[model samples]
Target: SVPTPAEAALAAQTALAADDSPMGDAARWAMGLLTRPEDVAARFIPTFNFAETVREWRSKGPFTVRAYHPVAHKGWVVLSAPAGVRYILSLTLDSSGLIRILTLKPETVIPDMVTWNDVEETLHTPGVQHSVYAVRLTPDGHEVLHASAPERPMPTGSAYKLYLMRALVAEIEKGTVGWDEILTLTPELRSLPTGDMQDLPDGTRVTVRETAHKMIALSDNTGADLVADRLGREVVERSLAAAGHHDPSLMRPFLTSHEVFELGWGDPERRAEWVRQDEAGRRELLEKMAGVMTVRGSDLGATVHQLGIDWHMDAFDVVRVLEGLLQDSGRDTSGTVEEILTAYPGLLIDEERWRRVYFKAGSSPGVMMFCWLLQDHAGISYVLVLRQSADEQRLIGDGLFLRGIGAKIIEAEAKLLSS
Candidate 1:
């Protein structure tokens, strides 16, 4: 039988009181306390102030273990304070009875970490037909770990938003636009999901800074289209060139989320016509599309089932761009893109686990990509990109697989560091 929450809480308290025993370590782990940020996956770190949170708990002295019970979702236990202040501790134990999920409620926002172990176990279970991954230190682009076909380009759903982010930053630094400059989303500029902008009025105003946040953080197609509209497809094309993408023509005519989805999803005849065109013809079509209204829908399932070509990149090119973002190349401002991109929720990584993390991911039928620019506590920065391609339905359900891959990488890095 599983230990009750009260029993777990009592064990943790008793162990912590000893201060120097193995129980103390167990207690600390149970509380989600870490001596070093790198000690745990970034996803597990609670949103509350870690040190202060633990300090206050210690100051209160050992309290009675009050109400305890199992959480219905995943067999996690919840322990509430016996009296006063309404403190809640949610936890789960490993085989050794060591706390593995230490979550303090009301203070710390429970992150997606709860499902991470599920991610880990299911990542290798099979579904994806082809996948590749790459990792390297930033700035230098030195390859540290790579797997499968890291050099082969794979279709990325909305992951291309990063390039638009780069271009927006460039305009900001050049005085062409201010981060705070308000921009309007005209009917012709709207796109589909991964953002709320599609629901807003065509001329609804938003700051460039806020738009940039939505573009990368939320993978907002409308937000991306808005930024791309301001900078022009040609500007993004140039930014891609300047960034040294391995295959420039792959993105010769940069498409907004609107154009890409519309051309592919709007009408089959148009999509086929657009696909058959030469580079010049495609450019002309995009120009013609400029006046077209954006398509809105929750069901792009049919559209996603149709195509192969979208914004494409390989692990090598991804790391190169990440290095540029980290070094702040082609921009006057520092940390502009990194700050906005990393604001996305971590992929099974703790906030304290790294000095910082810049993340962007996207998925559509037959494609899923997850990327990160991570800086560890020692100031060493790393870039990791993983892409998987398979059947449309399989790809759509592979978020867990992708996240599991992330956890696998984090664990690998941790082991390497310790060794």
Candidate 2:
């Protein structure tokens, strides 16, 4: 009989344990042995790159199982990798106990005791520039629990959706739009990953509420651009200022998700043209690109491709926006403001730990950002934003490390308040 899912998971780890590969025993073993040869390989040949994993395994080191938590047909495996890297493999098995779903991502964080100081130091991770802010919002005012370069404007990727959310709510309150308003799909709205909206039928219809929830929860690009399309560029930029964004000018002539990709990865001459243009010129150029620029994976640049192709803001601006929303959206805004934000509360600590939790994260090739507004058991709320960017390489993670730091902050805040 084939091994049980747990056994198969362990066996799979052991099979790939030996430090070596590149055809011969290593390649054949990967192709034949574990891949059923491994249970996982059989199902995900198309879903995953088997050929790539063989060589990647060789470069990344062993797949030794560090920890495994199994469910009836699904589980999480924390596999060990060299240099203290932990791989979080989210696995789900198909019937017949074949490991159907398999993916490994680096689950590493700042080492040793992760204190506020450590979080501050972690911000200086060599080639990365970071903005971190942790504050306790009291009825009286606010207190900075911790902060590091909170004023620096960094590319915030999807986190900018917070402002977009505010914009949509603004229109919703004016009765100009209804939450139940249905938006028709369009070719202009289809965008890249971190969302399913792009996959829907071109004419598919989605309610405004549905899109807002998706925009915040999934950081759905298409969903966000859909909202932007409905509001137009000016409304969002207005919200940016109303929410106290230090310099709305930086994000001026805001580009939609499709524009970011098309421009980030499109024709060189066109890209050069847009870069040199004044704000008005860039805005004008967008009309031309909107007519012809198509997002192609092949065109996606690994490197003009260099920064400034994304939304930009500082930690304080995120605070003001989130802060403004909670204060201004008196229970009258249909309550969607609160509902949409808490939709994707990354990792849970304890439901009782905080009476409420609101979260939004954004990322791209080199950008990773997290913003959380937590209302503790005592009714005191806290907002924490941590964003990191690197021009040297792409950053990847499920934010396991950052979430761990967040948990630490929550714990510290609770204690300090009690005292």
Candidate 3:
């Protein structure tokens, strides 16, 4: 259920009572604010710092923290409080909160890492934690607007699935893989029920193209794992390297949703223990993940981290990839005219000139990400990555930060493309 006045108050009060200490005042204050649900506040109150908040955040770290249990099945959300209220005046559902969602108070803001500086300066909220944010250009192309980044290496969640898609398509383009090839699911692959593949029975024969669609559209971890196995890890790494992305390690094979939950638990030993069990155990462990998605250290990591590795890619590269996916006419896939697009539309192009748009987004328990390619009016291409938050919502919901930043990407992309 969406947040309501009664639910909000209960959450705030429960959070307040959890403190059982002198800091109860903070929780009480936050609770008081929630009780009233005012549209405005004088300042930003440290919600996570309250006693109950502290306990909840420490226990959950990246999941929902409240005095009362949330109304839904522990979904993710992006929350905002007016200047000082810390009462969460704006609460919106998102994939995750790994990225920050920024809005201009009748001013201009674009998505980018640097934009956070402006958000900090304008908001003047000390102890403000970082989250991913979306940024884009103004219509006039003169002013930069909208920026948000909750923290570095924000989780792209299933958005990382795009990498697998890229790897598969890359191989298929190189004639290393056949789109029409059918792969049969095994108990090992389906045991986790992590992705769209769960719907199919073990031994169901599916085509490579179908696998990719499931990977991208439904974020099926099993499909991703199978694709990775089919493509070969070294090959995937090298493809990304061709694009000038080094330092990407395929530490695991394919990541199932359950494994995501295990990793999100942040107990490194959990994985280590799983590895100690069988003969192909370690290899199988590797088979469970495409790779850990990071802001830096991958193909896009260098750009996101500012490591300045000089992997030169510009508008053209963006155009090529997205267009390839859109038309399915690139080196990969038959030129049979497959129209591949993402879930979000008009986030990167002018709607009038470019009639259709598509994008896909992903979020983890705490992290959020937006990975997309769009068509342009001028026939140019655009790609965007908007992220928020860093903590895992395994304690509550995955992709908390991704969805928050998605809001920014959606808004900023619309504004930029329309202009």
Candidate 4:
């Protein structure tokens, strides 16, 4: 007979206590009773890097498991760190005794000195991909300070809304769209959460600037779709070139957050067919889906739905987009674009030293990105970006936890480079 969830969890705990290797194959074997050994690493740990965690556990050594029991919902066990700093480990299993969730939340605050001892080493963790582009800007280009895989392009979730805002602002400057132009809410324009416009009734009218406000400030998916719909596909596609994106074609015929879910997860055949189509074919295919499918948030299954499909931009190119937005992409501005970008300041750190700070970030299961464009008190502008992806598993948390840590590190590093 199969062991109970408690039995399996304790067995894994015992294996971890006995194992000395960094891979913790013993623990993996015990818990992997329900999931695969390799997958157990991902599913059994809250972090993308299990090997490093194993190393941390090994270095600490002689850890004592105090007690093990579950009462109602989640279970907890104290594997005391000999160093006296406590790390709270959380585990929850499904009804089938399969590991459902595992997280290690630090009881004591972890500062940059220990966690981010080396930015590169900290980033190059096992089973995860990372890109960091830290730079200072010039007229039309930038100066690189520290870079790690800066040319890498992975899926950026809502970060693509920056592109949407750029395209809308460009059209506004060209006299094609006005800041005050009113766009009405429609069933077709609605999207899933992360913004309130999705909950609004149809025919609700909003100005272009108001729509852009929510797009940047809240990463409003409906606001993004509304802006894109108003500008047309060709216009949004062309904005990428003017914004200096390295591969504008990577995002040709861009999909709204709603349509992305509709095609990517609403149906198996739709997603499969989408994976095989050429640019023009995908465009035509979307034309067919847009009028037919009405995808609600419930229709999508898993959160880790990005099968290598999203707005792609390298750190280098991403920084360029940041620069473009700050300069308004040659559109004469009364600092309005800067006004919008800085409105949210997504992640906060010590900002008293900076004249202006602009931020935008993106997340999905297995992906998290945070990038900021900061202007120092001396008027020198610098860009700092940290993006991580674990394609095989869902990334650790809601992203803000690591986002705060990364922001703190970047802020510290950038402060030194500034005059």
Candidate 5:
């Protein structure tokens, strides 16, 4: 009996898992094959050089591309690409260990050659400073740059909006919440706006869509708190687990048991035990921050180092929502996508290179973050994320610095396309 394509991919996925390759084992488990044989043969080779690819890509920019690990399964060799690059190549592999190109564009296409001088020049620029960067690119899947995207935990700040939105959307999907249901904005949800809260009145009525727009598009504080309260913190944590986040500690806006008991509902003894646990056990609690998005400080640096390796839900969801957000048709009249730094400043679309780019930007008094996806007319995809600490006095300069880096990426993309 001929093996169905699906079955074949499963078989190949199993075969690669069974193979002794250090890199492909996990990918074999995650992205099992559904690729065509000829495509696999064209893009993949068992001997693809992981070392050389990383060496080339890290040289091309201010941040070094993270670690590169290659596994030739499903007719493709899966590699870990960067979270910062705005484009990536899409690939599919079969169960027979054959790989095929699903879509290749300027973003997704990995170049056959890379140079060291490019890396040195890109890194030496004045504004780039000492930044941790890493990634892996593939033909079907292989490392062009391998450094790090290691995941652990961090202060996710407003990134929690995505997690809350995920829960809200899922609840809506399950008929637990309605998209158009009007939500009241209470004074309690409002946090001070130095960080971008619109400071709307206590009685404001917003539908689910409006709240999502405010929370995500604008990173509004009160909006996030409103959704968090409506959904319940514990439910948000479970919703994240359902959506694929394994550990709940990475979810932000978490609570101490004392805070829970302060509500005058729970037994103080149990609350004390919950807080009394060892550091690891206490960190394991995911119930408090149901509506918040978070990444820990310790996790941020490590996560970048293992960019292509770690399989965390926050990491994956970050990319998914970012891709969707960046591909939106809204356009700012300014030559730069900087206006997204504000609200949906304009809905005008720019087809400069005949490519669509829509993205969101966010920051807090203590944090600076950027999430975006870039696609070229050629159908390649790339995603980038940058987050760091920001003090009030330096806010203006830091804002420019962040936007400048984004501009640099867009410039690099244009360069790649023009060449």
Candidate 6:
């Protein structure tokens, strides 16, 4: 009989255990052993570059495999270093003693162990107000852990891209747009940082699918504007309505990513005039503003002032939207959505405990937001959303604390399941 996947996974782990192991030689010999080299290479190379992995092992010595867990089709080895670090090695092998797919990645955070009491204490801590919303659901859509303020709207930053992706998917399914449709990057659409599109010259053509991926996966501002334009602002509005968002008009004019940057970060004189303008005046200025390429540099203090103008939504509405996404929409769009979300590398979660995890998060100077959907081996699903708004000085510290708070929720849920 062919060796089980568990048995093959053990072999792969043993190969890595040897100090002077013939790991490279083994990979070379197993090159053709993989059934889908291109598919496996596309996913593996990006996650764990062969040369980079070797360099890490060399310079960052004393690595250890911390935990082993099985998923649907593969097994994972959670490796760790000193200083509470963690890495995941996803392994798959054939019955012929050949490793078919292997990938390694650094975990963004080690879920801090805390209890429900700990979370409540943090929530009540003085000098900072935490506007938190988190809900964990079973595989069948039953709520397991529901926290307070899940419905109170807060500025979402780039987390609004979730609505963008949903709207794009709906358009594709409606036959109104094609995923491969080309979009031209104009000067009006250009925005700062987090993407290579800013460096590209104007009039560059890219596909709608590519733009959507960049907007969510990499939080690319330029790509997001291009996508928002292609899909039209009304489409996104309808999506928000469909997601059961409260106060949809708060997103009036449905500011594209570029629009947000220009209005929020534009010249002092222009921003002053822009904010005071009536609806029509703001619209006219926006048209002219798009042509103005450069923006004024401002400190983090500006974000707090823009809260009334930026993308705003509550935690419960987000949960509703997420639950809709996870539901069987009778369309094949869920897989693509999952793929786009999973493409982000910095998702902080314990892979050893979950079969699959999806993440979407964004942070500006005073705003930090995170949304996660995790599926366990037994197929239960957990959803978490955290939104924190603070002054420039407190933003980073509060973000660190919230991440721990999120981990505590997960820990408490896990304990409940085990009990």
Residue 36, model 1: lDDT of: 48
Candidate 3 worst ten-residue window by lDDT: 301-310
Indicate the residue-level lDDT of 331 in model 2: 56
Looking at model 6, residue 192 earns an lDDT score of 67
Q: Candidate 5 at residue 6, lDDT?
A: 61
Each prediction's Cα RMSD? Answer: 13.1, 7.8, 13.8, 13.1, 22.4, 9.6
lDDT, residue 133, model 4: 75
Instruction: Compose the digit string of candidate 1's lDDT tens values, residues 198-275.
Output: 667768999988888878766778889888888887888988855647886876677777777777667677777776
lDDT of 6: 0.61
User: Model 1, residue 20: what's the lDDT?
Assistant: 53
lDDT by residue (1-419, candidate 3, tens digit) is: 77796688667656546744323433334334333123222223112123454344333222222323221112121233334222121221112221111111111222432344533443222332233332232334312233344223333455545556666766776787887898887765552322446446668998887777666554566677677768765676566534323234322333444345433343456445554544256446535533442221111111111211111222223223344455444443444223433433413344675544546555443333455554456654444545443222332223323333443544445454334
Point out where model 2 deviates above 4 Å. Answer: 1-48, 51-76, 81-86, 90-102, 105-107, 111-114, 291-293, 297-307, 328-330, 394-404, 411-419
Candidate 2 worst ten-residue window by lDDT: 19-28
lDDT of 6 by residue, 1-419 (tens): 86575676566556544423233333333222221446445434232255465555445435554444443223455556678676655554322223445655565343444554555555553443346555567555546354656656677777777777777777887899887799998777787644446657778998887787778666777888788888887678877888657777766667776666766766667778867877677678777776645653343245532545467888776776666665523256546656666665333356677776666666665677777767777766667787776555354442444654565666666653332
Q: Which candidate, 1 or 4, has the higher TM-score?
A: 4
Report lDDT (CA) for all predictions: 0.62, 0.69, 0.42, 0.67, 0.42, 0.61
TM-score of 3: 0.50
> Any runs in candidate 5 off by more than 4 Å, and if so which?
1-153, 194-198, 242-246, 252-317, 320-350, 354-358, 377-379, 389-397, 414-419
C-alpha positional error of residue 272 in candidate 4 after TM-score superposition, expressed in Å = 0.6
Tell me the TM-score of model 2: 0.78
lDDT of 6 at 343: 68
| Alpha-carbon runs more than 4 Å astray in model 4 | 1-110, 113-117, 139-141, 291-308, 329-333, 414-416
Superposing every Cα of model 1 onto the true structure, what RMSD results? 13.1
RMSD of 3: 13.8
Give the winner by TM-score: 2 or 5: 2
- Best-to-worst lDDT order: 2, 4, 1, 6, 3, 5
TM-score to native of every candidate shown: 0.67, 0.78, 0.50, 0.71, 0.47, 0.67
